Scaffold this active site. Structure first.
Site, PDB file in Angstrom:
ATOM      1  N   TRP A   1       0.300  -8.605   4.512  1.00 11.18           N
ATOM      2  CA  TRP A   1      -0.714  -8.463   5.324  1.00 11.18           C
ATOM      3  C   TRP A   1      -1.798  -8.547   4.657  1.00 11.18           C
ATOM      4  O   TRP A   1      -2.390  -8.374   3.634  1.00 11.18           O
ATOM      5  CB  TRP A   1      -0.540  -6.888   4.935  1.00 11.18           C
ATOM      6  CG  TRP A   1      -1.539  -5.350   5.545  1.00 11.18           C
ATOM      7  CD1 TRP A   1      -0.881  -4.695   6.776  1.00 11.18           C
ATOM      8  CD2 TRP A   1      -2.202  -5.140   5.455  1.00 11.18           C
ATOM      9  NE1 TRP A   1      -1.931  -3.777   6.488  1.00 11.18           N
ATOM     10  CE2 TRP A   1      -3.151  -4.144   6.145  1.00 11.18           C
ATOM     11  CE3 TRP A   1      -3.839  -6.024   3.609  1.00 11.18           C
ATOM     12  CZ2 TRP A   1      -4.205  -3.501   5.637  1.00 11.18           C
ATOM     13  CZ3 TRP A   1      -5.121  -5.528   4.184  1.00 11.18           C
ATOM     14  CH2 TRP A   1      -5.610  -4.210   4.978  1.00 11.18           C
TER      15      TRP A   1
ATOM     16  N   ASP B   1       8.322  -6.329  12.932  1.00 10.68           N
ATOM     17  CA  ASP B   1       6.958  -5.400  11.638  1.00 10.68           C
ATOM     18  C   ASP B   1       6.468  -5.033  12.508  1.00 10.68           C
ATOM     19  O   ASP B   1       5.483  -5.452  13.627  1.00 10.68           O
ATOM     20  CB  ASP B   1       6.610  -6.768  10.532  1.00 10.68           C
ATOM     21  CG  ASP B   1       6.002  -5.830   9.598  1.00 10.68           C
ATOM     22  OD1 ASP B   1       5.366  -4.290  10.020  1.00 10.68           O
ATOM     23  OD2 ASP B   1       6.236  -6.379   8.741  1.00 10.68           O
TER      24      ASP B   1
ATOM     25  N   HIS C   1       9.186  -3.714   8.829  1.00 13.65           N
ATOM     26  CA  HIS C   1       8.288  -3.876   7.802  1.00 13.65           C
ATOM     27  C   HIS C   1       9.038  -4.532   6.029  1.00 13.65           C
ATOM     28  O   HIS C   1       8.607  -4.498   5.958  1.00 13.65           O
ATOM     29  CB  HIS C   1       7.525  -3.655   8.013  1.00 13.65           C
ATOM     30  CG  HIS C   1       6.012  -3.327   7.002  1.00 13.65           C
ATOM     31  ND1 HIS C   1       5.417  -5.086   7.404  1.00 13.65           N
ATOM     32  CD2 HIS C   1       5.533  -2.910   6.389  1.00 13.65           C
ATOM     33  CE1 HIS C   1       4.295  -4.603   5.855  1.00 13.65           C
ATOM     34  NE2 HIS C   1       3.943  -3.836   5.103  1.00 13.65           N
TER      35      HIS C   1
ATOM     36  N   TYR D   1       1.103  -1.181   0.223  1.00 14.13           N
ATOM     37  CA  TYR D   1       0.251   0.070   0.326  1.00 14.13           C
ATOM     38  C   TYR D   1       1.001   1.638  -0.324  1.00 14.13           C
ATOM     39  O   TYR D   1       1.917   1.114   0.773  1.00 14.13           O
ATOM     40  CB  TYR D   1      -0.750  -0.202   1.412  1.00 14.13           C
ATOM     41  CG  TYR D   1      -2.620   1.162   1.004  1.00 14.13           C
ATOM     42  CD1 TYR D   1      -3.056   0.465   0.569  1.00 14.13           C
ATOM     43  CD2 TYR D   1      -2.080   1.908   2.167  1.00 14.13           C
ATOM     44  CE1 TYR D   1      -4.261   0.947   0.714  1.00 14.13           C
ATOM     45  CE2 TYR D   1      -2.883   2.452   2.821  1.00 14.13           C
ATOM     46  CZ  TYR D   1      -4.583   2.681   1.540  1.00 14.13           C
ATOM     47  OH  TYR D   1      -5.503   3.116   1.906  1.00 14.13           O
TER      48      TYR D   1
ATOM     49  N   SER E   1       3.452  -6.724   2.197  1.00 19.47           N
ATOM     50  CA  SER E   1       2.571  -6.481   2.410  1.00 19.47           C
ATOM     51  C   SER E   1       1.479  -6.728   1.834  1.00 19.47           C
ATOM     52  O   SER E   1       0.851  -8.129   1.584  1.00 19.47           O
ATOM     53  CB  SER E   1       2.937  -5.063   2.723  1.00 19.47           C
ATOM     54  OG  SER E   1       2.230  -4.627   4.121  1.00 19.47           O
TER      55      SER E   1
END
Length: 261
Positions: A157, A178, A209, A59, A132
């Site tokens: 993620w 993270d 992360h 993102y 992610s």
């Protein structure tokens, strides 16, 4: 003899090096089909057709965050497409659709006589990677397309951790510290949900992360593991079975797990 085996026999040094045996070139996708933008990295001198890997950022992020995988994997005998998404704010399901659209366009270019990758790709052998939300998208891609040969997301993620449907060999890179997608609530439950596949968990000690992104300080280890996993499973290349399946027994790794490897 394995028809998909490419390149010299691997050593730890050859897999830890910045570049593999093949010369790499790259081009920008002129008209991306179902995603925002793409760069294709390819070997100019492999001895046969090679599998293709599509890599998606997280993102807000762009190709820069994951670009280092392009030359690193392509130099070992893969066509690698790194993408920007249609929106930097796309969610994992959209990221997975776009990742698969990028693989489809690699197949299109393999059959396009003007393309530098014309006839260079074995379109039956493909893999997925990403960071992610792009790692969650990789896991969605694998769940929905079990003919994919390998997946290797990093710091994944996703709103659900249940990936028990995944039968694709999956290596999860994780980052110990993270704070965006904590290992305890994302990467590790995702790993533990997978019951049907070859799978591996590699957590970088002290990692933020971004611990597997371009510019990380563990490119020798992370690159060795990513290439070995893709070689073993996309190419069926058992010369890489130990590199793919072994615990590296490294002080840089705070958590290692593997099963069915």
């Amino acid at each position: 003899t394995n028809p998909y085996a490419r390149g010299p026999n691997p050593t730890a040094a050859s897999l830890e090096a910045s570049a593999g045996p093949f010369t790499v070139r790259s081009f920008t996708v002129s008209r991306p089909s179902g995603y925002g933008a793409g760069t294709v990295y390819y070997p100019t001198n492999a001895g046969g057709t090679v599998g293709a890997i599509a890599i998606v950022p997280g993102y807000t992020a762009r190709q820069s965050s994951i670009k280092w995988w392009g030359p690193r994997l392509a130099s070992h005998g893969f066509v690698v497409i790194t993408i920007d998404t249609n929106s930097t704010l796309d969610q994992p399901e959209s990221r997975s659709s776009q990742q698969m659209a990028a693989l489809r366009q690699v197949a299109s270019l393999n059959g396009t006589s003007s393309s530098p990758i014309y006839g260079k790709v074995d379109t039956a052998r493909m893999g997925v990677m990403g960071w992610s939300m792009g790692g969650g998208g990789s896991l969605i891609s694998a769940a929905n397309n079990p003919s994919l040969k390998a997946a290797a997301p990093q710091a994944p993620w996703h709103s659900s951790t249940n990936f028990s449907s995944v039968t694709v060999p999956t290596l999860i890179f994780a980052c110990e510290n993270d704070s965006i997608a904590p290992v305890n609530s994302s990467a590790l439950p995702i790993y533990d949900s997978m019951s049907q596949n070859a799978k591996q968990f590699l957590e970088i000690k002290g990692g933020s992360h971004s611990c597997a992104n371009s510019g990380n300080s563990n490119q020798a280890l992370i690159g060795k593991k990513g290439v070995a996993w893709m070689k073993r499973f996309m190419d069926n290349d058992t010369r890489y079975s130990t590199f793919a399946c072994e615990n590296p027994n490294s002080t840089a790794v705070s958590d290692f797990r593997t099963a069915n490897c």
